[PDB]
Amino acid sequence: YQATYDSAKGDLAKAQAAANIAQLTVNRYQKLLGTQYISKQEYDQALAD
Amino acid sequence: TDQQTLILNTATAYFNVLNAIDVLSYTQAQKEAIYRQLDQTTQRFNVGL
């Protein structure tokens, strides 16, 4: 239970880690939704990811 | 044949001037196309595509 517990919050840390990275790429597409150099499919794709 | 050849090569040479202008301008707008897709390509590298 302790290894599953601490392993579970470590996996929580990696999930919020790569989740935070993908959220920052969403924020890049928020910076780049003006001109046509990103895709709305990739904007909403990274949002659904 | 000097009036004839003179009209022949003044109009021929006129067509050569026209040819350098028109092929030059097609080189211009072709360069414009290479720079639009080049520039858009580089901007897609600025996000990393």
Burial class (CB in 10 A: 0-12, 13-18, 19+), B37: exposed
Extract the tokens encoding A16.
């919020």
Most A-contacting residue of B41, B46, B47 (CB-CB within 10 A), to test interface:
B47
How many residues are given for chain A? Answer: 49
A19 and chain B in contact, CB less than 8 A: no
Q: How far apart are CA B13 and CA A42, in angstroms?
A: 56
- Close Cβ partners of A42 (under 8 Å, ≥ 6 residues apart): A29
Extract the tokens encoding A2.
């302790």
Resolution in Å, one decimal, please.
6.5
How many residues are given for chain B? Answer: 49
